[PDB]
Design a binder for this molecule. Structure first.
Ligand SMILES: Cc1cc2nc3c(=O)[nH]c(=O)nc-3n(C[C@H](O)[C@H](O)[C@H](O)COP(=O)(O)OP(=O)(O)OC[C@H]3O[C@@H](n4cnc5c(N)ncnc54)[C@H](O)[C@@H]3O)c2cc1C
Ligand code: SF4
Ligand code: SF4
Ligand code: SF4
Ligand code: SF4
Ligand code: SF4
Ligand code: SF4
Ligand code: FES
Ligand code: FES
Lengths: 1172, 98
């Protein structure tokens, strides 16, 4: 039928009927904007960004709410749709208030993400901080050491106290990585293009770095014996250590960049040579000519430039200074020359300038350091005449000025006074400024000041294939400007090499400019970290460093003080994405009203900001139509429309479940989830696909992390439905806990002593062997938790077998659900995927409260779901239900053939009367063609499960598709623990403890000792081992504790409630050193069973466990079910001894007794809920 | 369509409406014999090796010439289909020379 073939945007597509055009274009990779669209709920039609032009319809049709037909023509980028989307986005931006990026990053010329790496330092991830920094420059330590930090001026912490020392943190992290493992960023595969870079300054080095990172081959031609440019030959040693720069350039050279020294372009190698032999040329020559005194007698011997003097100082040449030195100028050159001459044996140095101290262009810190060192300032003075004798200059004549009106740049103009003064000197150094010289390079256009003329935004000179940047274009400026220009020019050159030149253009962000000190009166005040500066005694005579780098403690203390000004949703916000894509300006107005809120919702998990809302309605639609709590709703009309909780109450006082679906469907930053880490940040986080470790539903999750810290959890919308509950969303926060154990401890004299892993292994094996020797067989019980993977449970069973015991148990499993004795397998007879096609679902227990994602799925399915009444708590009512089902005409012959003991059961129910409600429920179950039963194991006794199985068996609604019993378990791998044999009841363990038969216990991940009776039972032991993550109540009373890792650091598999085996992948490396599987493998190697890796364990599981045959090549990335990869159990008969269902009479039953929680993680979550 | 989804041979499959059960089983890697079937032309119904057992229908249905519906249970290796295919292949082999 050429499956519904359509034509969109000129292309021909094959799609499926009943879809939406938006879904089809997403399937075939065509981008159509949308904000209020979600495929799992009904269309809303609010934004209007998804309008497309369909031939035959005079008006625009929304692609989110129209069905694909055969042979329709669609256009998504016509002028009408473009202007409609532009208008909608302009109207949306007229009410949106926020900071897309913090002021500190926007003030930096290179746009380095200061908030991101400051926050990453505050979380203790230094390598990730350097990975953030090195996306914008290749030399972070030097730049952090010398930058005048314009970013630090714009920091909003200035509104409270001194701002964050951003540059010192950058230098600290760069030095910590240089002393440790040097980072090399990944490179694209080689493209074969050749780029020649003239000059190895910051601009040239940055261009070469960012061009070699794109696969090209870069060669640097340098006119000096060492690389660095004015960072080497202009910055003195006591401010920037040259060894640091040499090490950084060596790191860059290790990437494959060839630097050719002693080669001057124009004098030694012509530029035509580079033009002919290379695919691109980038000129980063910089400004290297000293301005003269611009006065009479400036050519006299004894007057030298500041730049040449500094270069001669750097090359360790022979210089002459004499006693008295006069430096003319006020920039950074004058300061550096003055202090260098002070360190070079000059007894007195004088600085001469024309404006006030307050109008010096140098930094105030450098001026104060120079004043402390001993250089005297001579003020309000300009050059007049240089007086000398016999070709030697000894005096400088000058005029005295006076203060005048401020200029347009904010500095007071000097005015002459007519007073002359002469100054004695032995050397005069002119440090007025630098000027660009082009040298012998020809056919390059230059401006009136000597700078290279380039096309703005494209960095192209008059000559083709030749580019320029840095001080050659902007004149003398700070180093970060040169780095930014080099990076932008590298991007432009890379685009040019691909055949299409695109100019560099800035981006649009939302910014807020009304923040004042009165808005930050609730913040605490913390003093800034002072810098340790060497005393003025040693500074005046030596060239060593005057300041020391931050220590780790100081860096943490400084970094934990940021305010997090930026938006946390920036890297996933769609409003800003469409604003950048559709060229919409974010500048505000004054008359238009953006309503500013004074909201206060201190919910511990959910954050709502009404200012960033776009009224897409996804959050309220999800919370009503899926979750069903309806904790939020719309209030008002028009501009007063706002989404807010029930009766304007706080979200904590309403029916909210903190599931986080409203957070996960929001397209902007209005709804946000709270922070799992120590200090959360806006960042591009790595994602790992795993499954939830709390319930038997086993929802797939994506763990978003940065380094060794997990930051958030999101649903997996591709492989599952994409729903989560509070435990899945906010439950991985124990992986970052600082109270986790790190090394095993052995008790001696009543105190725990830290031991090595080998000593721990020896101690546990020898003590277990001693217990076995002293008390014989069956003296050891193995108590495990159902949270462990399949391989760890199999290895624990192997350890139980090899230690000569049969007591393997769990407090959570506590003997299983009782369905095993009737049908043969203690497992669900149907999968979750069959809840969609059933026509009746009967729920037993609190399925909604305990496993809520299953309730979401049942509600979205729309099938008729009837809950078992609460006023029927005893099983006499279930016996009445059985009698009512029997009276409705069941086939007795088939149930006589396929079951054992049907006649006795029928005789037992002979005198049972039937009530009306029971009759109605029985009728509803009887007329249903394909009825399912969903039983919550947390709130239903085993005998009720047996009676429900009897009801399903006698009606013949079991053993086939879309009919049976679905049983949801308490924990993630309760089914796996059942399938490995951990099905012994706990009462046997208690009795064996109190009868003296059991002398030792091995507890893996459980906390039985939190209750007084079990603690009293454990106190009568002889040797107890606890494997746990935390020093719980049980581990305190043990004789030996071994740490465990969390579910974010383990590789393995989990068996779902419906017998589905899902792979669990490790996001971060084990913080204790060894995984649980490794610990069990070494213990079994000590006991004499040899396993190497997880493949051997999986092969052993396949070859020893009966129903997991095929796990060796199972490919757990797809759907794997353990009974012969079948969704339905008992298709060819039950799995009992005689292939018949075993029906046995059950007695009178009291009200259900609520079960307890024994897994340490699941009680830690409950206790940590109360902390906020 | 929400999800046209079927259950064949115990497994749960997601399919597309308007197809044949033979095409769906080939899509999901389930082997059903066929000799006179081609997806690009009309069904013929000659060999009979494509018969499957569908719940609700008392007689065998040919998977090459039936449309896939929602929530149907299909068995392709029951004893009746096995003996039918064995008989058909025994009758075919009674005239084949080579
Ligand atoms: C006294 C002084 C104080 C300073 N203080 C600061 C400060 O506080 N903060 C700060 O951030 N920066 C400071 N700087 C540095 C300066 O502000 C910038 O770092 C400057 O922009 C360096 O970048 P650039 O691109 O110009 O590189 P350059 O340093 O100009 O690099 C040019 C390179 O190309 C080479 N070259 C030149 N001509 C040719 C040719 N024809 N062929 C081949 N190679 C050639 C040069 O030898 C050099 O290696 C200071 C500099 C000086 C001199
Ligand atoms: S380079 Fe300068 S402006 Fe940029 S982050 Fe570092 S200190 Fe701030
Ligand atoms: S407080 Fe932090 S986020 Fe805000 S401007 Fe300062 S460094 Fe940037
Ligand atoms: S929600 Fe989006 S548009 Fe609004 S401030 Fe955050 S990043 Fe910017
Ligand atoms: S967290 Fe869940 S229940 Fe609470 S408001 Fe959001 S969607 Fe509704
Ligand atoms: S809070 Fe978020 S999801 Fe809800 S209407 Fe506003 S933008 Fe949409
Ligand atoms: S329902 Fe259970 S398995 Fe699913 S996310 Fe919640 S706690 Fe995890
Ligand atoms: S109107 Fe369709 S995406 Fe909003
Ligand atoms: S394949 Fe021949 S009858 Fe269907």
């Amino acid at each position: 039928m050429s499956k519904i073939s359509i034509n969109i945007n000129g292309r021909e597509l094959v799609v499926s009927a009943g879809q939406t055009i938006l879904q089809a274009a997403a399937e075939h990779g065509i981008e159509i904007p949308h904000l209020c669209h979600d495929e799992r709920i009904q269309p809303y039609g609010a934004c209007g960004l998804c309008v497309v032009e369909v031939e035959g319809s005079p008006k625009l049709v929304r692609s989110c709410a129209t069905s694909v037909q055969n042979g329709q023509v669609i256009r998504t980028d016509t002028s009408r749709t473009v202007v409609a989307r532009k208008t909608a986005l302009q109207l949306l931006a007229s009410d949106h208030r926020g900071d897309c990026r913090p002021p500190c990053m926007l003030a930096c010329p290179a746009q380095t993400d200061c908030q991101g790496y400051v926050g990453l330092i505050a979380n203790g991830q230094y390598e990730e901080a350097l990975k953030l920094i090195k996306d914008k420059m290749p030399i972070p330590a030097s730049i952090g050491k010398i930058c005048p930090h314009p970013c630090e001026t714009a920091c909003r912490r200035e509104l409270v106290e001194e701002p964050i020392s951003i540059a010192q943190l950058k230098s600290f992290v760069a030095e910590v990585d240089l002393n440790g493992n040097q980072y090399q960023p990944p490179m694209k595969p080689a493209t074969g293009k050749k780029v020649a870079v003239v000059g190895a300054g910051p601009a040239g080095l940055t261009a070469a770095y960012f061009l070699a990172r794109d696969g090209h081959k870069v060669v640097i031609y340098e006119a000096m014996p060492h690389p660095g440019g004015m960072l080497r030959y202009g910055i003195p040693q006591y401010r920037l250590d040259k060894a640091l720069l040499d090490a950084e350039v060596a790191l860059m050279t290790k990437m494959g960049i060839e630097i050719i020294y002693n080669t001057k372009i124009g004098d030694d190698v012509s530029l035509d040579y580079l033009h002919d032999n290379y695919d691109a040329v980038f000129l980063g020559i910089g400004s290297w000519q000293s301005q003269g005194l611009r006065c009479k007698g400036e050519d006299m011997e004894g007057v030298l430039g500041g730049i040449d003097f500094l270069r001669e100082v750097t090359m360790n040449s022979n210089i002459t200074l004499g006693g008295k030195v006069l430096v003319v100028g006020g920039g950074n050159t004058a300061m550096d020359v003055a202090r260098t001459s002070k360190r070079l044996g000059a007894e007195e140095v004088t600085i001469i300038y024309r404006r006030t101290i307050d109008e010096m262009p140098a930094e105030k810190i450098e001026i104060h350091e120079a004043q402390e060192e001993g250089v005297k300032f001579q003020l309000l003075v300009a050059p007049v005449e240089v007086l000398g004798e016999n070709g030697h200059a000894k005096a400088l004549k000058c005029e005295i000025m006076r203060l005048g009106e401020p200029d347009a740049s904010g500095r007071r103009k000097p005015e002459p006074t007519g007073e002359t003064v002469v100054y004695e000197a032995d050397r005069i150094i002119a440090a007025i400024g630098q000027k660009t010289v082009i040298g012998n390079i020809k056919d390059i256009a230059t401006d009136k000041s000597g700078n290279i003329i380039v096309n703005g935004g494209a960095f192209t000179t008059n000559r083709d294939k030749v580019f320029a940047g840095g001080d050659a274009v902007t004149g003398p400026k700070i180093a970060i400007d040169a780095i930014a220009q080099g990076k932008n020019a590298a991007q432009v050159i890379d685009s040019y090499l691909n055949g299409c030149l695109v100019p560099h253009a800035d981006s649009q962000y939302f910014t807020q400019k009304d923040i004042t000190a009165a808005d930050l009166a609730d913040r605490a005040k913390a003093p800034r970290v002072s810098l340790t500066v060497e005393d003025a005694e040693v500074r005046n005579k030596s060239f060593m460093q005057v300041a020391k780098t931050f220590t780790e403690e100081e860096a943490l203390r400084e970094s934990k003080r940021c305010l997090e000004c930026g938006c946390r949703d920036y890297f996933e916000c769609q409003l800003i994405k469409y604003i950048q894509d559709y060229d919409v300006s974010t500048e505000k107005d004054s008359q238009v009203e953006c309503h500013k809120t004074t909201e206060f919702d201190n919910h511990p998990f959910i954050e709502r900001n009404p200012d960033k809302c776009v009224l897409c309605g996804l959050c309220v639609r999800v919370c009503d139509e899926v979750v069903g709590a309806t904790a939020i709703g719309l209030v008002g009309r028009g501009f007063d429309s706002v989404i807010m909780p029930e009766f304007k109450l706080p979200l904590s006082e309403t029916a909210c479940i903190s599931c986080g679906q409203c957070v996960d469907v929001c397209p902007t930053g209005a709804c946000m989830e709270k922070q799992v880490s120590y200090k959360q940040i806006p960042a591009n986080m790595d994602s790992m696909a795993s499954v939830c470790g709390y319930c038997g539903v086993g929802c797939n999750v994506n763990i978003e992390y940065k380094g060794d810290v997990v930051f958030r959890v999101t649903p997996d919308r591709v492989n599952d439905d994409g729903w989560l509950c509070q435990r899945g969303k906010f439950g991985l926060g124990h992986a970052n806990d600082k109270a986790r154990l790190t090394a095993p401890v052995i008790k001696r004299n009543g105190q725990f002593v830290k031991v090595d892993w080998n000593e721990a292994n020896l101690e546990v094996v020898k003590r277990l062997q001693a217990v076995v020797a002293a008390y014989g067989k069956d003296s050891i019980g193995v108590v495990v938790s159902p949270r462990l993977t399949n391989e760890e449970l199999f290895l624990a069973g192997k350890l139980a077998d090899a230690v000569n015991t049969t007591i393997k148990t769990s407090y959570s499993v506590d003997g299983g659900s009782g369905l095993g004795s009737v049908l043969g397998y203690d497992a669900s007879t149907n999968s979750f995927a069959e809840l969609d096609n059933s026509d009746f679902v009967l729920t037993l227990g609190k399925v909604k409260e305990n496993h809520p994602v299953l309730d979401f799925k049942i509600r979205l399915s729309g099938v008729c779901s009837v809950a078992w009444p609460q006023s029927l708590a005893n099983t006499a009512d279930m016996k009445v239900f059985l009698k009512a089902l029997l009276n409705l005409g069941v086939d007795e012959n088939k149930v006589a053939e396929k079951t054992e003991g049907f006649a006795e059961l029928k005789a037992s129910l002979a005198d049972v009367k039937v009530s009306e409600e029971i009759q109605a429920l029985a009728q509803k179950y009887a007329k249903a063609a394909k009825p399912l039963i969903v039983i919550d194991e947390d709130t239903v006794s085993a005998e009720a499960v047996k009676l429900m199985a009897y009801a399903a068996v006698i009606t013949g609604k079991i053993g086939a598709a879309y009919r049976g019993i679905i049983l949801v378990r308490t924990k993630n791998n309760t089914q796996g623990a059942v399938d490995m044999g951990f099905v012994m009841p706990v009462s046997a363990v208690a009795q064996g403890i109190e009868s003296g038969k059991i002398k030792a216990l091995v507890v893996i991940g459980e906390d039985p000792a939190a209750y007084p009776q079990e603690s009293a039972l454990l106190q009568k032991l002889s040797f107890l081992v606890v494997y746990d993550m935390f020093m719980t109540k049980t581990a305190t009373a043990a004789d030996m504790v071994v740490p465990l890792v969390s579910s974010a650091e383990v590789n393995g598999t989990y068996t779902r409630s419906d017998r589905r085996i899902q792979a669990v992948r490790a996001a971060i490396q084990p913080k204790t050193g060894k995984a649980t599987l490794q610990i069990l493998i070494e213990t079994l190697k000590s006991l004499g069973i040899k396993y190497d890796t997880i493949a051997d364990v999986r092969a052993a599981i396949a070859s020893e466990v009966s129903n997991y045959a095929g796990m060796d090549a199972a490919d757990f990335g797809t759907t794997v079910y353990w009974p012969n990869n079948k969704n339905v159990l008992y298709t060819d008969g039950f799995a009992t001894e005689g292939q018949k269902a075993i029906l046995a009479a059950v007695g009178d039953v009291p009200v259900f007794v609520e079960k307890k929680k024994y897994d340490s993680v699941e009680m830690n979550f409950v206790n940590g809920r109360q902390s906020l």
